[PDB]
Amino acid sequence: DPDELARRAAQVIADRTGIGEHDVAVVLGSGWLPAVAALGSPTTVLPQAELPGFVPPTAAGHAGELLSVPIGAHRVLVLAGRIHAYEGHDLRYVVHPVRAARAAGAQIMVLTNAAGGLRADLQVGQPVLISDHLNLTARSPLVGGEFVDLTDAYSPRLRELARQSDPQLAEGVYAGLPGPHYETPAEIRMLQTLGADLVGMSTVHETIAARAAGAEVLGVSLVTNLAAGITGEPLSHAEVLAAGAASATRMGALLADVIARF
Amino acid sequence: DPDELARRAAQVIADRTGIGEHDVAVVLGSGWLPAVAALGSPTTVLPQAELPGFVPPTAAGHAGELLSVPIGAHRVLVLAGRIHAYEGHDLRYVVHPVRAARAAGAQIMVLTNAAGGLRADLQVGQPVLISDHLNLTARSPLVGGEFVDLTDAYSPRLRELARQSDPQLAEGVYAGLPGPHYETPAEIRMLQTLGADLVGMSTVHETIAARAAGAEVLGVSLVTNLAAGITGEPLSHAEVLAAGAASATRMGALLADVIARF
Amino acid sequence: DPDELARRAAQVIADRTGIGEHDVAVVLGSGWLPAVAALGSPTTVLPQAELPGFVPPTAAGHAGELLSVPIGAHRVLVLAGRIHAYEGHDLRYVVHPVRAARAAGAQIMVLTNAAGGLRADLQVGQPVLISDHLNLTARSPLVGGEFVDLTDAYSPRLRELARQSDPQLAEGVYAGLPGPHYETPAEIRMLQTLGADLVGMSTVHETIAARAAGAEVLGVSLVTNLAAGITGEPLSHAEVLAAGAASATRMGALLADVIARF
Ligand SMILES: O=c1[nH]cnc2c(Sc3ccc(Br)cc3/C=C/P(=O)(O)O)c[nH]c12
Ligand SMILES: O=c1[nH]cnc2c(Sc3ccc(Br)cc3/C=C/P(=O)(O)O)c[nH]c12
Ligand SMILES: O=c1[nH]cnc2c(Sc3ccc(Br)cc3/C=C/P(=O)(O)O)c[nH]c12
């Protein structure tokens, strides 16, 4: 039962953090993990693997940390590490962190991800607010007749507040793909035709699960590379894996300023 | 084996109905089920639960009935309550009623559904004939080298006959998506680019099964809402259900009149 | 571990062919099997069934044979028949042959398929070079964080070599669908907009697995039919077979001539 696992998780978070309510939660992608220190000083740090439902029975142990960070007036639940669909787990395990955070009081979910830019005007190292998504995974985290509206899934309100922090923040449509292979240049030309500005391998299921629970979502991509076929050179996975470190302080500063305005 | 289970269902169906052969079958969508009464009144009701292959043995009280109804010269199997792909069961369960109906003698399947309207001419409460479909589920109900042609899958002949009942009927391409979440606005703009006029969460697998089994198909959508981002307004799931209820009489009367013409 | 089973298949291929290393591998799909004779005189032939990890190919014509063929300065591993995703197999089994080929030395993978032509200038019986692919299966054969760049997935070098053998050879973008149903005319019109020239039900996962394992790929489609709705008539799936036989000694001699140039 996702609801039951989510409440058992929230209880242990409340115990281990001695805080009964975290009103904001941030999921950090690979691209945003470097920024963790620049968010603020945490009051508690525990292994995600010690939390009910975080470690998919499939196998392995989540390599990720949960952090409790005071930012402005807010008490922030920071999830440093996420599970991806491309690891082969049921989506229940992929969106569990979002549901656990909701059951722990989260009103707002900041979902960060790495992405390829598809739009001429995007640069490597640029943070881009997510205006909307294309779920191209042919899956949903919802089972049975759980009908949810995905109008304004990325709160226009939270994007206004983000732009009060930095009026030059660009907006884009994020295409969520299964991965883990990068796209062919032909797949990228297809995604351009379908209205995509950004391409990644996360987020869309977390957004659906967050909206189904009634939480507000802010989505932020880090453009870690231009998308396949755009440069005329191949994608370097080394340049991509290292992209977050080139932007850590700038990204951490941005998240901390924007969360303070919620 | 699906085909085996469909033949045994058809044997039980002929025994329990006293009817050796049902020449037509209707799958009632969510937005059509309330129109069961205006089709005619049945000679037999059957609990799906008591029929070979209909209900996964571990299932929630989905209820579901198979009715035997006379309409003009026709003995019509009416499926009241279908298994959607978003319940998460094998597609063999989703298409079993079409295969069972075929084995029972149905050479015409009337496939009904609820749909979001993408085309500017379409309004809430409008029945629309299906001219063709986009299968955006990345699935097929067919396994191995069952290779089947979907040219004229929605019989032009049957759309002709429908239009003798109501000559004003529009027609449109239906996109079947997994669901159960509704589309983001950006997903709808994508489906417009791809050539969809209607969007729903069923029908496409049933059509493929029907054509593979050698039955003609008439598809009918009730437009229960404008698709996401067609207005500036979010989708209401309650107004989608209201449109179902509100269209009941007109939709049952339409099907009844169309089926007498076959 | 797919990689252990691939190694162990390569050791058994080596011991039963008495050939330590094959530098080139050819996957012959549906309607290429006729061309196997004209590739050259095999040194050895084995049943694919005798090899660890190989599922018996069950499709039309598919022999389940392995042939060790000398062609120019190359020792060619010819897989006469493949496993399709539409048979319901985990992709680890679909791409196992490509991985085994690679563990036995394959530097180059020649992947052939049947395809429908979406450009009406293409002729039944025409071989078309694959320039790029659209993976429309919503799947990957890679599991966990296996990040692979698919820029130049279909080696430009190898297509230039093929055009040296036959300068008239067309190239096109292959849309890989799940199958096994053929597409609606609406779906074909959708695939044109997504930038596809060819449509089939194989190859894309084999290509990803080959690039993942460090092999170069040449893709060659045989146009067996014009795609649904391109001509007003339906598709004939006994005339899809007739293209395969008509294109035997032509195809087989083209492949032998192209590999000699590698
Ligand atoms: O061009 C692109 N295509 C498709 N996807 C991408 C990503 S997404 C990514 C790339 C590398 C690592 Br490691 C992890 C992830 C997921 C990250 P997450 O932040 O969403 O968890 C970045 N660039 C592209
Ligand atoms: O905008 C839209 N997007 C996607 N799907 C839809 C449907 S489909 C539906 C809506 C409510 C209930 Br309850 C069930 C279903 C499935 C119904 P079925 O009729 O095919 O069985 C109506 N409108 C939309
Ligand atoms: O118009 C078309 N649409 C989609 N696909 C095709 C194929 S290819 C094919 C069609 C049906 C079955 Br069943 C199997 C295969 C693949 C065999 P392969 O091993 O060569 O890939 C030929 N024409 C079309």
Author numbering:
A (entry chain A), B (entry chain C), C (entry chain B): 7 to 268
Question: How is this structure described in the published paper?
Answer:
Purine nucleoside phosphorylases (PNPs, EC 2.4.2.1) are cytosolic enzymes involved in the purine salvage pathway metabolism in most organisms. The enzyme degrades (2′-deoxy)nucleosides based on 6-oxopurines to the corresponding purine bases and (2-deoxy)ribose-1-phosphate. Purine nucleoside phosphorylase (PNP) is a well-known molecular target with potential therapeutic applications in the treatment of T-cell malignancies and/or bacterial/parasitic infections. The results are supported by a crystallographic study of eight enzyme-inhibitor complexes and by ADMET profiling in vitro and in vivo.
To obtain information on the binding pose and interacting residues, crystal structures of recombinant MtPNP in complex with inhibitors 18c, 45b, and 45q were determined and refined to high resolution. Inhibitors 18c, 45b, and 45q bind to the active site of MtPNP through eight direct and three water-mediated hydrogen bonds. Compounds 45b and 45q have different substitutions at the central phenyl moiety. Substitution by bromine at position C4 leads to changes in the orientation of the phenyl moiety as well as the shift of helix (same as in human PNP) to avoid sterically clashing with a side chain of His243. These structural changes do not affect inhibitor affinity toward MtPNP since the IC50 values for each inhibitor are similar, leading to a conclusion that the active site is flexible and the movement of the helix allows the protein to accommodate inhibitors with different substitutions at positions C4 and C5 of the central phenyl moiety. Crystals of MtPNP in complex with 45b and 45q were obtained using the EasyXtal 15-Well Tool, hanging drop plates with reservoir volumes of 500 μL and 2 μL drops with protein:reservoir ratio 1:1. Crystals of MtPNP/45q were obtained using the reservoir containing 25 mM magnesium chloride, 100 mM TRIS pH 7.5, and 25% w/v PEG4000. Plate crystal dimensions 400 × 150 × 10 μm grew in 3 weeks.
